[PDB]
Amino acid sequence: SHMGGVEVLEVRTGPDAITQIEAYLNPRMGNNIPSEDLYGYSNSINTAFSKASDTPNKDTLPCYSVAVIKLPLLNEDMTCTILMWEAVSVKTEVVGISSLVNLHQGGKYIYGSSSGCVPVQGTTYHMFAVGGEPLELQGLVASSTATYPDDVVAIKNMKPGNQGLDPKAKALLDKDGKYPVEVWCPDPSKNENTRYYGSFTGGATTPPVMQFTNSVTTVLLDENGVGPLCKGDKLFLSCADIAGVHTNYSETQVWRGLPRYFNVTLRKRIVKNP
Amino acid sequence: SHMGGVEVLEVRTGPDAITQIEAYLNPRMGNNIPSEDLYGYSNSINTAFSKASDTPNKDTLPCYSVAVIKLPLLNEDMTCDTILMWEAVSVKTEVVGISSLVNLHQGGKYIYGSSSGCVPVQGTTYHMFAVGGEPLELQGLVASSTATYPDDVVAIKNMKPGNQGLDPKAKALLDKDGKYPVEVWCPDPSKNENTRYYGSFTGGATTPPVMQFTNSVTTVLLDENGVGPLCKGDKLFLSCADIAGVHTNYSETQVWRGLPRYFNVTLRKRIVKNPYP
Amino acid sequence: SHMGGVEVLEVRTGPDAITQIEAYLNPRMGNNIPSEDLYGYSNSINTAFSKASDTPNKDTLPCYSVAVIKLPLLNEDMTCDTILMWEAVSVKTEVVGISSLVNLHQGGKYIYGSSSGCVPVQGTTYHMFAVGGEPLELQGLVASSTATYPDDVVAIKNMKPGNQGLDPKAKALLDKDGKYPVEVWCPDPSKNENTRYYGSFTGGATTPPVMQFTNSVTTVLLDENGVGPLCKGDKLFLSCADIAGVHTNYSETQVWRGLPRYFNVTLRKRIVKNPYP
Amino acid sequence: SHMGGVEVLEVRTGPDAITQIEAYLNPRMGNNIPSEDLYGYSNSINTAFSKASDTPNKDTLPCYSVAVIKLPLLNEDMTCDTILMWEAVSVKTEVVGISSLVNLHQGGKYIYGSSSGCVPVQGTTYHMFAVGGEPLELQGLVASSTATYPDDVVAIKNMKPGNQGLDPKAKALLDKDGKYPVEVWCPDPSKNENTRYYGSFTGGATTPPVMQFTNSVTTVLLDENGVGPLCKGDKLFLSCADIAGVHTNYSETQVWRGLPRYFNVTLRKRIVKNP
Amino acid sequence: SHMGGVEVLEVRTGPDAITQIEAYLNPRMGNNIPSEDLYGYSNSINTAFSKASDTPNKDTLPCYSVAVIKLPLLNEDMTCDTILMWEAVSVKTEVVGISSLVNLHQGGKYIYGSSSGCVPVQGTTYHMFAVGGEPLELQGLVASSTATYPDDVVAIKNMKPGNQGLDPKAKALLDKDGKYPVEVWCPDPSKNENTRYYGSFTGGATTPPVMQFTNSVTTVLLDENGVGPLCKGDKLFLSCADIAGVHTNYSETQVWRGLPRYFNVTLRKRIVKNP
Ligand SMILES: CC(=O)N[C@H]1[C@H]([C@H](O)[C@H](O)CO)O[C@@](O[C@@H]2[C@@H](O)[C@H](O)O[C@H](CO)[C@@H]2O)(C(=O)O)C[C@@H]1O
Ligand SMILES: CC(=O)N[C@H]1[C@H]([C@H](O)[C@H](O)CO)O[C@@](O[C@@H]2[C@@H](O)[C@H](O)O[C@H](CO)[C@@H]2O)(C(=O)O)C[C@@H]1O
Ligand SMILES: CC(=O)N[C@H]1[C@H]([C@H](O)[C@H](O)CO)O[C@@](O[C@@H]2[C@@H](O)[C@H](O)O[C@H](CO)[C@@H]2O)(C(=O)O)C[C@@H]1O
Ligand SMILES: CC(=O)N[C@H]1[C@H]([C@H](O)[C@H](O)CO)O[C@@](O[C@@H]2[C@@H](O)[C@H](O)O[C@H](CO)[C@@H]2O)(C(=O)O)C[C@@H]1O
Ligand SMILES: CC(=O)N[C@H]1[C@H]([C@H](O)[C@H](O)CO)O[C@@](O[C@@H]2[C@@H](O)[C@H](O)O[C@H](CO)[C@@H]2O)(C(=O)O)C[C@@H]1O
Ligand SMILES: [Ca+2]
Ligand SMILES: [Ca+2]
Ligand SMILES: [Ca+2]
Ligand SMILES: [Ca+2]
Ligand SMILES: [Ca+2]
Ligand SMILES: [Cl-]
Ligand SMILES: [Cl-]
Ligand SMILES: [Cl-]
Ligand SMILES: [Cl-]
Ligand SMILES: [Cl-]
C-alpha cells in the first residue's frame, strides 16, 4: 500500500475573480408588451403602395433586443489602474423552438381545409452580441423613400445613398425594441469591444432551421486574447431572433420572434486607467 | 530470438466501477398504446376555427418521451460525509426505424396522379435527446396563449399572452412519459446543470426529412468542469422526442409520425460529498 | 561525399498477416436478375387501396444486399486455447454508377412540356453499408402493421400495430441477399457489437439526390476499445442498400432505382482466445 | 511573498513594422452613384429577343468593385539590392447591410395574394472577395458570344463562340471600379500569384439567399510557401462582388441587388530582393 | 548589436527535382469545337419515344474531358535497376467561368412572365476531376440498356440489361477527349491504383447549382502508403467533367452547359525500381 490521490466530487465555489450572469431577452417583433394579444409577433405586414409611398404601420417592424446587466462594482475611486470585468465566454440558446412544432394554430392550410396549417416559415434572422458597451450600428435600407413610424429610430436625413453604406448613418443599440432590423446592422468598422454573431436566410417560404443544446460555449477573446471589457461595470447583451412569418387565413402575415437566453462568464482584470 | 509482447484478443470484463445500460423509448405522438391502430402516430390534426377557438382534439399533440432507469444501489443509507453516485460519462444514441419511411405504397396523397407513388412522411421535424441525473427541466412557451389544451396533457397553468414569450413562471419537470406536449415545453436553459440535452428542429410545410444512423458515434457527457450527470437516488433519466414529419392521408387529413430512440449510456462510480440533508 | 539513404519506390508485398479483399454488390430493388428488362429497378409501385388493403406487388419492394466473403482458412480445427481470426480494420467503399443518373433523354415524365428533357431520378434516398464478422442484426419496424407483404420477402412474423414502433420480438439476421425489405428492417442498435454500420436517409416526394465519389477516403473499423470486426468461421459480411430515388414514367408510374456498391476491406490476422465450445 | 508577474490590460500601439487598414466598397450593380434613386440595384433586366439579338441596356449588368488603397511609402531609394514591401498577412471581411433584406413591406410581387407580404430578394447569388498586391487578373467567359455589351462596361475584345469556353486571349485586369461585368469576367486561376481570392456562387431562379456576419473571423493570406500578397508600389488592391439576389417588382420586372463589403487587412513590412 | 539572420523574400526557382504544370481543359458537352455557335453546350436534348426506342442525337451527350501532358524526359537509359519517374504530389484545381451563370438576360424561358428575367442554368450537376499516371479506368453502367448510342461516342460493347447494374465486362480507359459519355461511364473503384479522383453529383429536375472558387486550396495526392501517382512514360493524365446544369430555351428545349477546369499539379522526381 501507498499514499495516493483520489478525486472526490463536491460543490466548488469559484474564485472571487470569476463571476457568471444569466439573462433572457424577450423578442421585440412589434407587439412588445406581454399583455398584448399578439405579443411575440409583429402586427400584420402592410406593403408599400409604391416606391415613393411606403409607410410601414406601427408595430410591423421587428427591432433588436438589448439588455444592460449591472455587474458588481469594482472601483471605489476612478483616479488611480482600475479593475474591469472581462467577458471571456458565453453560452446562448434560442428558447421556445419547439413552439413552432404546431400545425393546429389557425392560418393558411398546407393543402385544403382538412389538412394542418402552414407553420412559421420564410425569412429568418438570428444574431447575438456580448459587449462592454452598446453594439455599434450601421444604417442601410432596401429603400430610402420608406417613411418609418414615430416609435422607431430610423436613419436621419435619409437619401438614396442609404441603400448602400453611408458613413453618416450610425447609431448605438441603446434602447430595447426601438432599432429596426431592416434599417440597422452591426457596424464592422467599430465594435472593437463587442463580439457579434449572426445568420440570415431569406426566401419567401423557406423552412426555418434551429438547434438547441446546453453543451456549447463560445469563447469571447479576440485575436489579441482579450474579451469585452465592461465600461462602468455594465455588460451589454443584444440579439434578434426572427423565426419566420406566420400566415393567417386571409393571407396577412406577421413576423414571429423567439426569446434568447445568455450565460456569460466574466473575470476581474487590472486595466491601465485611460 | 528474445522475449517480447504480443497482443491477444479476449473477452474483458471491465472494472466493477463502470457499468453500461441500454434502453429504448417508443414515441408518444398521441396514439401511445401499442394496441392502437395508429400507434406511433397522432390522430388527425384538427385546426383552429380562430385565434380564440383553438381546441386540439385528444391525442393530436406529440409529447416528450421519458424513462427512468434504476441503477445498481450504491449506498446503505444517506448518513455519511461522502456517498457513491453514478456519473454518466458518455452515450451512444440512435433513432430506430428510419428505413420504415422508405415506403411509397402506404395509402395517402399521390405524388403526381393516381398511378404514382404516395407522398412519404415530410414536413416539420423535431429531434432531441437528453441524459441526466434528475428530470429534464422545462420552460413553457406557446404559439398562441388562447389555445385550449386537452385535460390529458400537462399545459401551462393560467395561460396569458405573455406565454407567447418567456415567462419565468411557466416551468415544469419532464417527469411523465407521453404527457408534456412538444409544442408547449422546451428545455429550460437557465437550469439543467445536471442534464445534457441536444436538439435539432427543421420546419416548413412539406420539407424532406433527413436522418442518419450509425453505431460508430459516442457523445461525451462531461461538462466544462469535466463532470457528467450525477444520478440522484441512483436513477438515470433518458428523455427524447423524434418527430419525423407528417403523413398525409388521401382526404388531406394529416398525422404526426414519430420514431423510437435507443440509448446506450456508460456510467462510473464516484465519491461525492453527500448532498442530502 | 558520404554514405546516406535515399528512398526508392518499389512494389512491396505486404506482411503475410495482412490481406485485402475487394467485392461489389449489385442492388436488389425488386428486379434482381441481370436478364430482366428492369434489372436495377423495382417494378411499378402499386399503392394501397386503404389502410386495411395494402398489398405490395411482387418485386416492388427494395431489399438489402448482402455478400459473404470466404477468407483464407486460418486454423486446422477449433480445439486450441487460442485461434487465429481475421480482424477487419478499415474499408474503402464507393457507390458505383452515380453518373448514370446524369441523363435527361431516358423516356419518362417531361420536366416542362413535350420539348424538354425528362425528369431524372429523384425523391427518397437511402444509403447504408455495413462490414461485420457475422450477419447484420436487424430490428423490424413498419409504417403500417396492416400491410400484406409478398411471400418472396422476409416480413415481421405475426405483425401487430405495436410493430409501428419498436417491438423487441421483431428481430432478424441479414442472412439472405435481396430478401429483407428496407421498409421493414433496419439495423438493430441494441446488438451489432461485431459489425460497423453507417447510414443516411433523405426523404421527400421529389427531392434531388446528392452523392459523392472518390478513391481517397478510408473508414477505420476499430471500435472504442480498438478492436475491429472479428470474422467468425473466416467469413466477412458485407451489407448495403443504395436507393438513389425513383424514376417516373410518362404514365406517372414510378419505380425505385438502386446502384451497386464497391467494398475494399483490409484485414489482419489476430490471436484470439477461442470462443467456440 | 515573492516578485512575480501579473498581466495588466492596456492600449498597445502595434510594432512599427505592422499596419492595419480598413475600407468599405459599395456595390456596383448598375446604379453606381449615390444620387440615383436605385443606387445599390441594377436597372430593370431586359432580356434577349433571340440568340443573335441580345443587347443588355446600360446599367443592367452587375460589375466588380475595386479599391486601391495607398499604403505608407517605404522606399525613397529604389536602387538598392533590396526594397521594403508591405506583405498582407490576414484579412477580416464582412458583407454589410444583410439585415436590410429582412423586409417584407417593400413594394413588389406578393408572396401569396395582395394581402400578404412582398417577395424578398432571392434567386442567384454571387459573393467573392480578393486581397492582392496588384490588380486581380481576370479571365473572360460568357454564356453567349453573340450578346452585344454596352459601351460603359469593359467586355471581351473580338468576341467569338470560343469565348463560351476558356480562350486564353480573353484576359483583363480588374483596374476600374464598377466597369467589369460579373457575367463576363472571373478570376484567372492561371495567374493571380500575388492575390488571394475567395468566391461562392449559388444559382437558380428563386433560391433563398444565405449570409452570415460576425466580427470574430480572420482569414490568413499566406500562400503555400508562407508568403502573403506583396504590395507593388505600396498599393493594396481590394476587390469584390456581393450580389444578394434579385428584387421583383409588381410588374415582374427584376433588378439585381448588391450589398457593400468591409475589409480590415493587416500588413507587415518585409525586406524583398529588388526586382 | 550582433550578427543575426533576417528573412528576405525573393524569387526562388524550386529544386530541379520539383516541377509544376498548369493546364486547362475545355468542356465537352457535345458542341466541342470553338467554331460552333453552341460551343460549351450540348445540342438540344432529344428524349426517347419509349424504352425500346431511345436514340440520343449526335452531340447531345456530355462527355469527359482528358488531357495528356508530356513531362520532361527523365530516362535516356531504360535498362538499369532503377528508373526516374515523376510523382504527382499535389494539385490545385478550379472550375473557370462560374460567374458566366450570373446572367438573367440570356434568351430563354422566363422566370415569371415575359417582363421578368430568364431562368438561369439549373438542374442536374456533375463535377469531377482526376489526376493520374495513366488513363483513368472506367466502369460502364447505364440507366437503360436499350438506348442506342451514336457512332461518335464510345459506349458499352454488346449492351444488355445487366449493364443497368455492374457488369465486370463493361470496362474502358478514358483515352479520348470528348468521346466517353458521362451517363455511360464512371470511375472504376476496383482499379485506379495510380490515379486520384474526386466527384460530386446533385440531381433533380430544376435544382439550383452551387459552386465555389478560390486559389487558396491544395489537395494532397499521396495515397495511404504516402505515394502519389507515378507518371508512366513521363505522361500526366488530367481528367474531368463539369456539368453546371441545363439551359432552357423559350421553346422549352434544353441543352447541357459545361465549364472549363484549371489544374496546377506539383510533381517530384523519384527513383523507382525498374518494372
Ligand atoms: C399570429 C396569430 O395568432 N394569428 C392568428 C390571427 C390573428 O389573431 C388576427 O389576424 C389578428 O387580428 O387570427 C387567425 O384567426 C382568425 C379569427 O380569429 C377570426 O375570427 O377570423 C379570421 C378569418 O379570416 C381568422 O380565422 C387568422 O387570421 O387566421 C388565426 C391566427 O392564428
Ligand atoms: C397513418 C396511416 O396509417 N394513415 C392511413 C389512414 C388512417 O387509417 C385513417 O385516415 C385514420 O385512421 O387511412 C388511409 O386509408 C383510408 C381508408 O382506410 C378508408 O377506407 O378510406 C379512406 C378514403 O379517404 C382512406 O383511403 C387514408 O386516410 O389515406 C390510408 C393511410 O395510410
Ligand atoms: C425505368 C425505365 O426504364 N422505365 C421505362 C418504362 C418501362 O419500360 C415500363 O414502364 C415497364 O413496364 O417505359 C417507358 O416507356 C414506355 C414505352 O416503352 C411504352 O411503349 O409506352 C409507354 C407509354 O406511356 C412509355 O412511353 C415509360 O413508361 O415512360 C420509358 C421508361 O424509361
Ligand atoms: C428595387 C426597387 O426599389 N423597386 C421598386 C420599383 C422601382 O422604383 C422602379 O421599378 C424604378 O423605376 O417600383 C415599385 O413600385 C412601383 C411604383 O413606384 C409605381 O408607381 O407603380 C408601379 C406599378 O406596377 C409599382 O408599384 C415596383 O415596381 O413594384 C416598387 C419597388 O420596390
Ligand atoms: C444555349 C443558348 O444560347 N441557347 C439559345 C438558343 C439557341 O441559339 C438555339 O437553341 C440553337 O439551336 O436560341 C434561343 O433564341 C432563339 C432565337 O435565336 C430564335 O430566333 O427563335 C427562338 C424562338 O423560340 C429563340 O428565341 C432560344 O431558343 O430561346 C436563345 C437561347 O439563349
Ligand atoms: Ca475602425
Ligand atoms: Ca440558473
Ligand atoms: Ca445489447
Ligand atoms: Ca501561370
Ligand atoms: Ca482491384
Ligand atoms: Cl442616422
Ligand atoms: Cl406553468
Ligand atoms: Cl419477426
Ligand atoms: Cl479580351
Ligand atoms: Cl464495354
Author numbering:
A (entry chain D): 25 to 104, 106 to 299
B (entry chain E), C (entry chain A): 25 to 301
D (entry chain C), E (entry chain B): 25 to 299
From the paper:
Only some of these binding sites were occupied with ligand, whereas access to the remaining binding sites was blocked by crystal contacts. Both compounds bound in essentially the same manner to each binding site. The terminal Neu5Ac residue, which is best defined by electron density and has low temperature factors (B-factors), inserts deeply into a cleft and engages the protein with multiple contacts. Consequently, 80% of the accessible surface area of Neu5Ac (317 Å2 of a total of 399 Å2) is buried upon binding. Whereas Neu5Ac in the context of 3SL was readily bound, the analogous α2,6-linked oligosaccharide 6SL was not recognized in both glycan array and crystal soaking experiments. Due to the α2,6-linkage, the overall shape of the trisaccharide is somewhat kinked and differs from the linear orientation found in α2,3-linked compounds. An α2,6-linkage would likely lead to loss of the hydrogen bonds involving Gal and clashes with the BC2cw- or HI-loops of LPyV VP1. However, the Glc residue in GM3 would most likely be buried in the head group layer of the membrane, and modelling suggests that membrane-bound GM3 would clash with LPyV residue F73 when the Neu5Ac is inserted into the binding pocket.
Attachment of the LPyV major capsid protein VP1 to receptors on host cells is clearly critical for the restricted tropism of the virus. LPyV VP1 forms a ring-shaped homopentamer in which the five monomers are arranged around a central five-fold axis and connected by extensive interaction surfaces. Sialic acid is a crucial component of the LPyV receptor as removal or modification of cellular sialic acids abolished or modulated LPyV cell binding and infection, but the identity of the sialylated LPyV receptor and its role in tropism are not known.
